[PDB]
Symmetry: none
Subunit: 85 residues, 4 copies
Protein backbone atom coordinates (compact mmCIF):
# COMPACT_ATOMS: atom_id res chain seq x y z
CA UNK A 1 0.00 0.00 0.00
CA UNK A 2 2.35 2.69 -1.24
CA UNK A 3 1.46 6.23 -0.11
CA UNK A 4 3.26 9.14 -1.75
CA UNK A 5 2.94 12.79 -2.74
CA UNK A 6 2.66 14.62 -6.03
CA UNK A 7 3.63 18.30 -6.09
CA UNK A 8 3.71 20.57 -9.13
CA UNK A 9 3.29 24.19 -10.29
CA UNK A 10 0.21 24.33 -12.47
CA UNK A 11 0.46 26.33 -15.68
CA UNK A 12 -2.67 28.17 -16.78
CA UNK A 13 -2.43 26.64 -20.24
CA UNK A 14 -1.79 23.02 -19.24
CA UNK A 15 -4.58 20.90 -17.81
CA UNK A 16 -3.48 18.10 -15.49
CA UNK A 17 -5.00 15.57 -17.87
CA UNK A 18 -6.50 13.47 -15.07
CA UNK A 19 -10.01 11.94 -14.99
CA UNK A 20 -11.35 10.97 -11.55
CA UNK A 21 -14.20 8.89 -10.16
CA UNK A 22 -15.52 8.55 -6.59
CA UNK A 23 -13.78 6.22 -4.16
CA UNK A 24 -14.41 5.23 -0.54
CA UNK A 25 -11.30 7.04 0.61
CA UNK A 26 -11.03 9.78 -2.00
CA UNK A 27 -10.84 10.18 -5.76
CA UNK A 28 -9.53 7.41 -8.00
CA UNK A 29 -7.57 8.19 -11.15
CA UNK A 30 -9.68 6.47 -13.76
CA UNK A 31 -7.78 7.93 -16.69
CA UNK A 32 -4.59 9.90 -17.34
CA UNK A 33 -3.35 11.87 -20.35
CA UNK A 34 0.41 11.33 -20.73
CA UNK A 35 2.68 14.31 -21.44
CA UNK A 36 1.16 17.11 -19.34
CA UNK A 37 3.46 17.26 -16.30
CA UNK A 38 6.67 15.30 -15.48
CA UNK A 39 5.61 15.00 -11.83
CA UNK A 40 2.50 13.15 -12.99
CA UNK A 41 4.12 11.07 -15.73
CA UNK A 42 6.84 9.89 -13.31
CA UNK A 43 4.59 8.91 -10.38
CA UNK A 44 0.88 8.45 -11.15
CA UNK A 45 -0.97 5.45 -12.61
CA UNK A 46 -4.63 4.53 -13.12
CA UNK A 47 -6.14 3.10 -9.99
CA UNK A 48 -4.10 5.33 -7.70
CA UNK A 49 -6.35 7.17 -5.29
CA UNK A 50 -5.99 10.83 -4.41
CA UNK A 51 -6.81 11.13 -0.72
CA UNK A 52 -6.10 14.82 -0.21
CA UNK A 53 -5.57 17.86 -2.39
CA UNK A 54 -4.16 21.18 -1.21
CA UNK A 55 -5.02 20.60 2.42
CA UNK A 56 -8.50 19.10 1.94
CA UNK A 57 -9.03 15.46 2.91
CA UNK A 58 -11.21 13.97 0.19
CA UNK A 59 -12.61 10.97 2.07
CA UNK A 60 -16.28 11.34 3.00
CA UNK A 61 -17.03 14.35 0.80
CA UNK A 62 -19.93 14.52 -1.66
CA UNK A 63 -19.00 12.41 -4.68
CA UNK A 64 -19.29 15.50 -6.94
CA UNK A 65 -16.03 16.82 -5.48
CA UNK A 66 -14.05 14.22 -7.45
CA UNK A 67 -15.62 15.34 -10.71
CA UNK A 68 -14.49 18.93 -10.13
CA UNK A 69 -11.37 18.41 -8.00
CA UNK A 70 -9.07 20.30 -10.38
CA UNK A 71 -11.49 22.89 -11.69
CA UNK A 72 -10.00 26.28 -10.86
CA UNK A 73 -6.65 24.67 -9.99
CA UNK A 74 -3.86 27.24 -10.15
CA UNK A 75 -0.35 27.73 -8.83
CA UNK A 76 0.36 25.16 -6.13
CA UNK A 77 -0.95 21.65 -6.75
CA UNK A 78 -0.20 19.24 -3.90
CA UNK A 79 -1.67 15.72 -3.75
CA UNK A 80 -1.43 12.83 -1.29
CA UNK A 81 -1.93 9.51 -3.06
CA UNK A 82 -2.47 5.83 -2.26
CA UNK A 83 -1.99 2.92 -4.67
CA UNK A 84 -4.20 -0.22 -4.29
CA UNK A 85 -3.15 -3.79 -5.22
CA UNK B 1 -32.52 38.42 2.78
CA UNK B 2 -34.85 35.57 1.82
CA UNK B 3 -34.49 31.81 2.33
CA UNK B 4 -36.51 29.28 0.36
CA UNK B 5 -36.40 25.80 -1.11
CA UNK B 6 -36.50 24.53 -4.65
CA UNK B 7 -37.47 21.00 -5.59
CA UNK B 8 -37.75 19.63 -9.12
CA UNK B 9 -37.47 16.31 -10.96
CA UNK B 10 -34.67 16.16 -13.54
CA UNK B 11 -35.60 14.74 -16.94
CA UNK B 12 -33.02 12.64 -18.80
CA UNK B 13 -31.13 14.75 -21.30
CA UNK B 14 -32.46 18.03 -19.95
CA UNK B 15 -29.66 19.85 -18.08
CA UNK B 16 -30.61 22.32 -15.36
CA UNK B 17 -28.75 25.07 -17.21
CA UNK B 18 -27.33 26.80 -14.13
CA UNK B 19 -23.74 28.04 -13.96
CA UNK B 20 -22.34 28.39 -10.45
CA UNK B 21 -19.43 30.14 -8.70
CA UNK B 22 -18.01 29.83 -5.15
CA UNK B 23 -19.66 31.75 -2.31
CA UNK B 24 -18.80 32.08 1.37
CA UNK B 25 -21.94 30.14 2.32
CA UNK B 26 -22.42 27.94 -0.74
CA UNK B 27 -22.62 28.13 -4.54
CA UNK B 28 -23.82 31.34 -6.18
CA UNK B 29 -25.93 31.07 -9.33
CA UNK B 30 -23.79 33.20 -11.65
CA UNK B 31 -25.81 32.60 -14.83
CA UNK B 32 -28.79 30.51 -15.94
CA UNK B 33 -30.68 29.27 -18.98
CA UNK B 34 -34.28 30.43 -19.07
CA UNK B 35 -36.76 27.77 -20.17
CA UNK B 36 -35.13 24.59 -18.87
CA UNK B 37 -37.29 23.96 -15.81
CA UNK B 38 -40.44 25.73 -14.56
CA UNK B 39 -39.20 25.39 -10.97
CA UNK B 40 -36.06 27.31 -11.94
CA UNK B 41 -37.88 29.93 -14.03
CA UNK B 42 -40.26 30.41 -11.07
CA UNK B 43 -37.98 30.75 -8.10
CA UNK B 44 -34.33 31.24 -9.05
CA UNK B 45 -32.34 34.31 -10.05
CA UNK B 46 -28.70 35.22 -10.59
CA UNK B 47 -27.13 36.00 -7.24
CA UNK B 48 -29.08 33.36 -5.32
CA UNK B 49 -26.89 31.09 -3.21
CA UNK B 50 -27.49 27.35 -3.05
CA UNK B 51 -26.58 26.43 0.54
CA UNK B 52 -27.55 22.77 0.53
CA UNK B 53 -27.94 20.28 -2.29
CA UNK B 54 -29.61 16.86 -1.91
CA UNK B 55 -28.92 16.74 1.80
CA UNK B 56 -25.35 18.02 1.61
CA UNK B 57 -24.60 21.34 3.27
CA UNK B 58 -22.28 23.23 0.92
CA UNK B 59 -20.61 25.64 3.33
CA UNK B 60 -17.23 24.25 4.35
CA UNK B 61 -16.76 22.03 1.30
CA UNK B 62 -13.84 22.67 -1.09
CA UNK B 63 -14.85 25.61 -3.31
CA UNK B 64 -14.60 23.44 -6.41
CA UNK B 65 -17.73 21.47 -5.45
CA UNK B 66 -19.68 24.29 -7.11
CA UNK B 67 -18.25 23.26 -10.47
CA UNK B 68 -19.93 19.85 -10.75
CA UNK B 69 -22.67 20.07 -8.14
CA UNK B 70 -25.27 18.54 -10.49
CA UNK B 71 -23.30 15.61 -11.90
CA UNK B 72 -24.96 12.27 -11.26
CA UNK B 73 -28.09 14.05 -10.04
CA UNK B 74 -31.12 12.19 -11.40
CA UNK B 75 -34.62 12.12 -9.95
CA UNK B 76 -35.75 14.79 -7.52
CA UNK B 77 -33.33 17.64 -7.04
CA UNK B 78 -33.67 19.39 -3.70
CA UNK B 79 -32.02 22.73 -3.00
CA UNK B 80 -31.99 25.15 -0.08
CA UNK B 81 -31.42 28.73 -1.23
CA UNK B 82 -30.56 32.12 0.25
CA UNK B 83 -31.32 35.35 -1.58
CA UNK B 84 -29.52 38.63 -0.69
CA UNK B 85 -31.39 41.96 -0.92
CA UNK C 1 -17.52 41.78 -39.24
CA UNK C 2 -19.70 38.82 -38.36
CA UNK C 3 -20.99 38.81 -34.76
CA UNK C 4 -22.63 35.66 -33.45
CA UNK C 5 -23.29 33.59 -30.33
CA UNK C 6 -22.08 30.25 -29.08
CA UNK C 7 -24.21 28.46 -26.48
CA UNK C 8 -23.57 25.02 -25.00
CA UNK C 9 -24.05 22.87 -21.88
CA UNK C 10 -20.64 22.17 -20.45
CA UNK C 11 -19.93 18.63 -19.30
CA UNK C 12 -17.69 18.23 -16.27
CA UNK C 13 -15.48 15.78 -18.14
CA UNK C 14 -15.08 17.72 -21.40
CA UNK C 15 -12.88 20.79 -21.55
CA UNK C 16 -13.84 23.36 -24.18
CA UNK C 17 -10.46 22.88 -25.84
CA UNK C 18 -9.96 26.60 -26.46
CA UNK C 19 -6.74 28.60 -25.92
CA UNK C 20 -7.13 32.37 -25.59
CA UNK C 21 -4.88 35.43 -25.68
CA UNK C 22 -5.60 39.08 -24.82
CA UNK C 23 -7.28 41.32 -27.37
CA UNK C 24 -8.30 44.99 -27.40
CA UNK C 25 -11.97 44.07 -27.34
CA UNK C 26 -11.88 40.75 -25.51
CA UNK C 27 -10.22 37.36 -25.76
CA UNK C 28 -8.98 35.99 -29.08
CA UNK C 29 -9.14 32.27 -29.85
CA UNK C 30 -5.50 31.53 -30.55
CA UNK C 31 -5.99 27.78 -30.69
CA UNK C 32 -8.85 25.26 -30.76
CA UNK C 33 -8.99 21.51 -30.14
CA UNK C 34 -11.44 19.94 -32.60
CA UNK C 35 -13.96 17.35 -31.36
CA UNK C 36 -14.98 18.67 -27.93
CA UNK C 37 -18.37 20.29 -28.61
CA UNK C 38 -20.48 20.46 -31.82
CA UNK C 39 -21.46 24.07 -31.04
CA UNK C 40 -17.77 24.98 -31.14
CA UNK C 41 -16.77 22.80 -34.10
CA UNK C 42 -19.63 24.23 -36.19
CA UNK C 43 -19.07 27.94 -35.47
CA UNK C 44 -15.67 28.90 -34.02
CA UNK C 45 -12.34 29.50 -35.79
CA UNK C 46 -8.93 30.82 -34.73
CA UNK C 47 -8.85 34.58 -34.73
CA UNK C 48 -12.46 34.90 -33.61
CA UNK C 49 -12.71 37.12 -30.58
CA UNK C 50 -14.87 36.37 -27.57
CA UNK C 51 -16.27 39.70 -26.40
CA UNK C 52 -18.51 38.49 -23.59
CA UNK C 53 -18.97 35.32 -21.58
CA UNK C 54 -21.94 34.54 -19.36
CA UNK C 55 -22.95 38.16 -18.93
CA UNK C 56 -19.47 39.65 -18.45
CA UNK C 57 -18.16 42.02 -21.11
CA UNK C 58 -14.51 41.13 -21.60
CA UNK C 59 -13.26 44.36 -23.15
CA UNK C 60 -11.09 46.43 -20.82
CA UNK C 61 -10.54 43.76 -18.17
CA UNK C 62 -7.13 42.74 -16.84
CA UNK C 63 -5.44 40.61 -19.49
CA UNK C 64 -5.25 37.68 -17.03
CA UNK C 65 -9.00 37.15 -17.42
CA UNK C 66 -8.47 35.68 -20.90
CA UNK C 67 -6.02 33.13 -19.57
CA UNK C 68 -8.57 31.85 -17.05
CA UNK C 69 -11.85 32.62 -18.83
CA UNK C 70 -13.10 29.02 -18.74
CA UNK C 71 -11.58 27.90 -15.47
CA UNK C 72 -14.46 26.77 -13.28
CA UNK C 73 -16.83 26.80 -16.26
CA UNK C 74 -19.88 24.63 -15.57
CA UNK C 75 -23.42 24.21 -16.81
CA UNK C 76 -24.37 27.15 -18.99
CA UNK C 77 -21.68 28.44 -21.35
CA UNK C 78 -22.81 31.45 -23.40
CA UNK C 79 -20.39 33.44 -25.60
CA UNK C 80 -20.73 36.50 -27.84
CA UNK C 81 -18.15 36.43 -30.61
CA UNK C 82 -16.72 38.67 -33.33
CA UNK C 83 -14.70 37.53 -36.35
CA UNK C 84 -12.01 39.87 -37.80
CA UNK C 85 -10.93 40.00 -41.48
CA UNK D 1 -9.13 42.53 10.47
CA UNK D 2 -5.75 43.68 9.14
CA UNK D 3 -4.83 45.36 5.85
CA UNK D 4 -1.29 45.42 4.51
CA UNK D 5 0.74 45.42 1.32
CA UNK D 6 3.15 42.95 -0.16
CA UNK D 7 5.75 43.84 -2.76
CA UNK D 8 8.32 41.47 -4.23
CA UNK D 9 10.36 41.05 -7.42
CA UNK D 10 9.63 37.83 -9.35
CA UNK D 11 12.66 35.85 -10.51
CA UNK D 12 12.48 34.06 -13.86
CA UNK D 13 11.52 30.42 -13.39
CA UNK D 14 10.56 30.87 -9.75
CA UNK D 15 6.75 30.69 -9.42
CA UNK D 16 5.09 32.44 -6.49
CA UNK D 17 3.57 29.14 -5.38
CA UNK D 18 0.23 30.55 -4.26
CA UNK D 19 -3.08 28.84 -5.06
CA UNK D 20 -6.11 31.13 -5.02
CA UNK D 21 -9.90 30.83 -4.84
CA UNK D 22 -12.71 33.39 -5.37
CA UNK D 23 -13.68 35.72 -2.52
CA UNK D 24 -16.38 38.36 -2.20
CA UNK D 25 -13.73 41.11 -2.09
CA UNK D 26 -10.92 39.52 -4.10
CA UNK D 27 -8.87 36.32 -4.33
CA UNK D 28 -8.35 34.21 -1.21
CA UNK D 29 -5.00 32.48 -0.75
CA UNK D 30 -6.25 28.89 -0.37
CA UNK D 31 -2.82 27.22 -0.24
CA UNK D 32 0.84 28.22 -0.60
CA UNK D 33 4.34 26.85 -1.06
CA UNK D 34 6.67 27.73 1.78
CA UNK D 35 10.16 28.75 0.68
CA UNK D 36 9.48 30.40 -2.68
CA UNK D 37 9.78 34.05 -1.70
CA UNK D 38 10.84 35.67 1.60
CA UNK D 39 8.16 38.34 1.14
CA UNK D 40 5.53 35.59 1.00
CA UNK D 41 6.98 33.57 3.89
CA UNK D 42 7.06 36.81 5.92
CA UNK D 43 3.66 38.31 5.40
CA UNK D 44 1.18 35.91 3.80
CA UNK D 45 -1.00 33.15 5.22
CA UNK D 46 -3.85 30.95 4.03
CA UNK D 47 -7.09 32.88 4.31
CA UNK D 48 -5.57 36.23 3.35
CA UNK D 49 -7.45 38.01 0.57
CA UNK D 50 -5.63 39.76 -2.26
CA UNK D 51 -7.84 42.78 -3.04
CA UNK D 52 -5.67 44.50 -5.63
CA UNK D 53 -2.94 43.19 -7.89
CA UNK D 54 -0.54 45.42 -9.87
CA UNK D 55 -2.95 48.33 -9.84
CA UNK D 56 -6.06 46.31 -10.64
CA UNK D 57 -8.79 46.19 -8.01
CA UNK D 58 -10.06 42.61 -7.92
CA UNK D 59 -13.52 43.11 -6.44
CA UNK D 60 -16.09 43.17 -9.24
CA UNK D 61 -13.99 41.23 -11.76
CA UNK D 62 -15.22 37.84 -13.05
CA UNK D 63 -14.44 35.27 -10.33
CA UNK D 64 -12.17 33.37 -12.70
CA UNK D 65 -9.53 36.12 -12.62
CA UNK D 66 -8.27 34.43 -9.43
CA UNK D 67 -7.21 31.42 -11.49
CA UNK D 68 -4.46 33.10 -13.53
CA UNK D 69 -3.82 36.29 -11.58
CA UNK D 70 -0.04 35.88 -11.83
CA UNK D 71 0.34 35.00 -15.51
CA UNK D 72 2.56 37.43 -17.38
CA UNK D 73 3.63 39.01 -14.09
CA UNK D 74 7.36 39.73 -14.26
CA UNK D 75 9.29 42.33 -12.31
CA UNK D 76 7.85 43.84 -9.15
CA UNK D 77 4.65 42.25 -7.94
CA UNK D 78 2.50 44.55 -5.85
CA UNK D 79 -0.42 43.27 -3.79
CA UNK D 80 -2.90 44.83 -1.38
CA UNK D 81 -4.12 42.31 1.19
CA UNK D 82 -6.87 41.97 3.79
CA UNK D 83 -6.59 39.53 6.68
CA UNK D 84 -9.69 38.36 8.63
CA UNK D 85 -9.44 37.67 12.38
Amino acid sequence: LEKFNVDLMKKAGKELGLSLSPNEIGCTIADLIQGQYPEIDSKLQRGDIITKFNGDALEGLPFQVCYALFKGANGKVSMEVTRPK
